[PDB]
Amino acid sequence: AMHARSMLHLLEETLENVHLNSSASPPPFTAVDLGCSSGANTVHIIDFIVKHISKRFDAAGIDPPEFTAFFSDLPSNDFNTLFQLLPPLVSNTEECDGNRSYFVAGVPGSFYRRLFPARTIDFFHSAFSLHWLSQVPESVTDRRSAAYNRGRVFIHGAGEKTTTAYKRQFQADLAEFLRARAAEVKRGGAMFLVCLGRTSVDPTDQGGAGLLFGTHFQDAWDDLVREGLVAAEKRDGFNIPVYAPSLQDFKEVVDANGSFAIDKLVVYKGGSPLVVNEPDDASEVGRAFASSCRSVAGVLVEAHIGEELSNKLFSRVESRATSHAKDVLVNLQFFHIVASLSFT
Amino acid sequence: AMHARSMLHLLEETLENVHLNSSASPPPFTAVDLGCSSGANTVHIIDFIVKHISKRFDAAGIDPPEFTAFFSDLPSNDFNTLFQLLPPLVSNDGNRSYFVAGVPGSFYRRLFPARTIDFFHSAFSLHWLSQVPESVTDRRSAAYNRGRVFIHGAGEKTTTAYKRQFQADLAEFLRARAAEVKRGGAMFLVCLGRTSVDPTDQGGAGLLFGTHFQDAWDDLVREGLVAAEKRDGFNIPVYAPSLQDFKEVVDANGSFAIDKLVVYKGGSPLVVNEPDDASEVGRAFASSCRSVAGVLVEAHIGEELSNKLFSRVESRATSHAKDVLVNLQFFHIVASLSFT
Numbered sequence: 001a002m003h004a005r006s007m008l009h010l011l012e013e014t015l016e017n018v019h020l021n022s023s024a025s026p027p028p029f030t031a032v033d034l035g036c037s038s039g040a041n042t043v044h045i046i047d048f049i050v051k052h053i054s055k056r057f058d059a060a061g062i063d064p065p066e067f068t069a070f071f072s073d074l075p076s077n078d079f080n081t082l083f084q085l086l087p088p089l090v091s092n093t094e095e096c097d098g099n100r101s102y103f104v105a106g107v108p109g110s111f112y113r114r115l116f117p118a119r120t121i122d123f124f125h126s127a128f129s130l131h132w133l134s135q136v137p138e139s140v141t142d143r144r145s146a147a148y149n150r151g152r153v154f155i156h157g158a159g160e161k162t163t164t165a166y167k168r169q170f171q172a173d174l175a176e177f178l179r180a181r182a183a184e185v186k187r188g189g190a191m192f193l194v195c196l197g198r199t200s201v202d203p204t205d206q207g208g209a210g211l212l213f214g215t216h217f218q219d220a221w222d223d224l225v226r227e228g229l230v231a232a233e234k235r236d237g238f239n240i241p242v243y244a245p246s247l248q249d250f251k252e253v254v255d256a257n258g259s260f261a262i263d264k265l266v267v268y269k270g271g272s273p274l275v276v277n278e279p280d281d282a283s284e285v286g287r288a289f290a291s292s293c294r295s296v297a298g299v300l301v302e303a304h305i306g307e308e309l310s311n312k313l314f315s316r317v318e319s320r321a322t323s324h325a326k327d328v329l330v331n332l333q334f335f336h337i338v339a340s341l342s343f344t
Numbered sequence: 345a346m347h348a349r350s351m352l353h354l355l356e357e358t359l360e361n362v363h364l365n366s367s368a369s370p371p372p373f374t375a376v377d378l379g380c381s382s383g384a385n386t387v388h389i390i391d392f393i394v395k396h397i398s399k400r401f402d403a404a405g406i407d408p409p410e411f412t413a414f415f416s417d418l419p420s421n422d423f424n425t426l427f428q429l430l431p432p433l434v435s436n437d438g439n440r441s442y443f444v445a446g447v448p449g450s451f452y453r454r455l456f457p458a459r460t461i462d463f464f465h466s467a468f469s470l471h472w473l474s475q476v477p478e479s480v481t482d483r484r485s486a487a488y489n490r491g492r493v494f495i496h497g498a499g500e501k502t503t504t505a506y507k508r509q510f511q512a513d514l515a516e517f518l519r520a521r522a523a524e525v526k527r528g529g530a531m532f533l534v535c536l537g538r539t540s541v542d543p544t545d546q547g548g549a550g551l552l553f554g555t556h557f558q559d560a561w562d563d564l565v566r567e568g569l570v571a572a573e574k575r576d577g578f579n580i581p582v583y584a585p586s587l588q589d590f591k592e593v594v595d596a597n598g599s600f601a602i603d604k605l606v607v608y609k610g611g612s613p614l615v616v617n618e619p620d621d622a623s624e625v626g627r628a629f630a631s632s633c634r635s636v637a638g639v640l641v642e643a644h645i646g647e648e649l650s651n652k653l654f655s656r657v658e659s660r661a662t663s664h665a666k667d668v669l670v671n672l673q674f675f676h677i678v679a680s681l682s683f684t
C-alpha cells in the first residue's frame with residue numbers, strides 16, 4: 001500500500017494547476033468523482049480534494065468557498081450504500097478525518113456523455129473506471145463478423161480483427177467522454193485521470209488485465225464447457241467489456257479532442273492488486289485472485305449464465321490460482337496510466 | 345383523482361412567480377424536490393416543472409437553459425429504486441431532458457451552496473417531525489403521552505410540545521431554504537393540515553393515526569406480546585399544522601414573501617375500487633398506515649408483532665367501514681412563497 005502516498009502526489013500536482021478565483025468572496029467550488037462506487041475510496045479522495053483546495057485558499061489569506069462534491073456512476077451503482085457512508089455536515093461556529101465540510105450529491109448516468117450543465121465543474125476526478133467499455137463492441141457480438149471472439153471470453157488471447165474492434169470502442173468512448181468533460185469544465189479548471197493500461201504495442205497483450213481475465217478466468221470458462229452446464233457458442237457469446245490502453249491509444253484521443261492541455265502524462269508500475277496477508281500461503285493466493293474477478297465483473301457472468309453456475313466458475317478460478325500460485329505473485333503486475341489535464 | 349388537475353394549477357401559478365434570466369443565454373436552471381421518495385410522483389412533478397419553465401422561455405423566444413433536478417430525502421430513502429426509474433437523457437412523456445442528482449440529508453438544515461437554487465418544491469413531507477419531541481419521550485415530563493401512541497387523543501402539554509417541534513423544524517427549514525434560493529426564485533409548499541384551532545384535533549391525521557391504529561395498539565396490550573409502558577414509549581412523530589401555525593413561522597423568518605396561502609379539502613387518501621365493499625375499506629386504510637410509518641413500529645416492536653397490529657387495524661377499519669368513507673378527510677395547506 002506504500003504507493004498511494006506517491007499517487008496522492010500526482011493528484012496534488014494537478015490540484016495546483018487549477019485557476020482559483022482571486023476575489024475576496026470566491027463562488028462555490030465544484031468537484032466530481034467520475035466512476036465512484038459505494039466504497040470509502042470515493043469519499044476519501046473527495047475529502048482530499050476539498051482539503052487541498054481549501055489549504056490553497058488559506059495560503060492566499062482567503063476564506064475557502066463553499067464546496068459541492070458530485071459522486072457519479074451508472075444508475076446501477078449502490079448509491080444507497082454510498083449515501084450512508086457520507087459523514088454529517090459541520091455544525092456551528094467540540095469540533096476537533098471524521099467529519100464533512102462540503103455539500104454532496106450522487107449523479108446517475110454514464111460519463112461517456114453529458115452529466116452536467118456547461119462550464120460548471122472546477123475539477124473532474126476519475127480513477128480505474130475509464131478502462132470499462134461503454135459496451136461490448138457490436139462487431140465482436142456478431143457471429144458472422146471476423147471480430148467475433150470465438151473461444152476466448154476476452155481479447156488478451158488473440159485476434160487482430162477482435163483487438164482492433166476493442167481499441168476503436170475505447171477511443172470512441174474516451175472521445176465522447178472528453179468532449180463531454182470539455183463542455184462541463186470551468187475556464188480555469190483541470191482533470192485528473194487514472195486508468196489501467198499496458199506497455200505492449202499490440203492490443204493482444206493486455207498486460208495486467210490480460211493476466212486477470214485471460215488465464216484462470218477463461219480456463220474456468222473452459223472447464224464449464226469441458227463439462228456440461230455450459231455450451232460452446234455460449235462462452236463465445238460472453239465478452240468482458242474491458243480495454244487497457246497504451247500511451248499511444250490514450251494520448252491520440254487527447255490531441256484529437258484538443259480542448260484539454262496535457263500538463264503531465266505517465267505510465268508506471270503500480271502492480272499487484274491482491275491483498276495477501278500470508279504471502280507463502282498457496283490458498284490465499286487463490287481466493288484473493290478469485291475475489292478480484294468477482295468484484296470486477298461477477299454481475300455479468302450471472303446475467304449470461306446461472307447464479308449457481310457462476311459460483312462453480314468463480315470456484316474453479318480460485319482453485320486454478322492456488323495451483324499456479326507461484327506464477328501469479330510474480331507475474332501479476334498492473335500498469336497504470338495517469339493524465340493530468342487542464343482546460344485551455 | 346380529479347383534484348390533481350386543480351393542484352397542478354397552484355404549482356403553475358408559483359412557477360410564474362420566478363424571475364427568469366432575460367439574457368439570450370440564461371445560466372443553468374436548478375429545481376429541487378424536497379422529500380422525494382422512490383415512486384413516480386417525484387419524477388412527474390420535476391418533469392412538469394422543467395416543462396413549464398421551458399414553455400415560458402419559448403414564450404419570450406429564448407432557448408431554454410440547461411436544467412438540473414435535485415431529488416432530496418433522508419439517507420434511508422431508496423435512491424437505488426429512484427435512480428432506476430429516471431428516464432434516460434435525450435440523444436442527438438417517456439423521455440428526460442434535464443440532468444439529475446440525488447441528495448442525501450435532512451432538509452431541516454442546509455443541503456446546497458448559498459444562492460444556487462431557482463425553485464424548491466416539497467409535497468407531503470413538512471408534516472414529519474425531525475424527531476419526537478424530547479419532552480414527550482421523558483417519562484417524568486407532563487408531555488409524556490401515556491396510553492395514546494399519538495396527539496389526536498388529548499393533552500395540552502403534549503400537544504403544545506409537538507407544535508413547538510413543528511415550528512422549530514419548519515423554522516430551521518425556512519432558514520436553510522432562504523440561504524439557498526436565487527434572488528428571483530420561489531418555493532411551492534404542500535403538506536397536510538387541519539382547521540381545528542386546538543392541536544388536540546389533528547383532522548385527517550387524527551383519524552388516520554388516532555382511531556383504529558392506536559386501538560390495535562390497545563389490543564396488543566389487552567393481550568400479551570406488548571407491555572403498557574411500551575405503547576406509551578411509542579410516538580408517531582407527525583404534526584398537522586393549522587394556518588396560524590404555518591403562517592406564523594413564515595413571517596418570523598421574513599425572507600420569503602407570501603404570494604399565496606391556502607387551506608382546502610383534498611380529502612380521502614384511499615384508493616377504493618369497490619366503494620360498498622366493507623373489506624376493501626379495511627386493507628386500504630391499513631395499507632396507508634403501513635406505507636406511512638410501518639418501519640417505526642418494527643424498530644420498536646417485533647416484525648411479526650407488527651404484522652399482527654397492522655392486521656388488527658385492517659380488521660377494525662372494515663368493522664366500522666361506514667364511519668370511514670364519510671369521516672376520513674384530509675385538509676391540505678399549500679404555500680406559494682417567493683424570495684424578497
Ligand SMILES: Nc1ncnc2c1ncn2[C@@H]1O[C@H](CSCC[C@H](N)C(=O)O)[C@@H](O)[C@H]1O
Pocket residue numbers: 034035036037039041042072073074077109110111112126127128129132134
Ligand atoms: N460509463 C460509466 N459511467 C459512470 N461510471 C462508470 C461507467 N463505467 C464504469 N463506471 C464505474 O466505474 C467504477 C469502476 S471501479 C472504480 C472504483 C473507484 N473509482 C476507485 O478508485 O476505487 C465502477 O463503480 C463502475 O460502475
Ligand SMILES: Nc1ncnc2c1ncn2[C@@H]1O[C@H](CSCC[C@H](N)C(=O)O)[C@@H](O)[C@H]1O
Pocket residue numbers: 378379380381385386416417418421449450451452466467468469472474
Ligand atoms: N427531514 C427530512 N429530510 C428529507 N426528507 C424527509 C425528511 N422528513 C421526511 N422526509 C421524506 O419525505 C417523504 C414524505 S412522503 C412524500 C412523497 C412525495 N413527496 C410525494 O409527493 O408523493 C418521505 O420520503 C421522507 O423520507
Ligand SMILES: [Mg+2]
Pocket residue numbers: 149150151152153154235236237238239
Ligand atoms: Mg468470447
Ligand SMILES: [Mg+2]
Pocket residue numbers: 489490491492493494575576577578579
Ligand atoms: Mg405514547
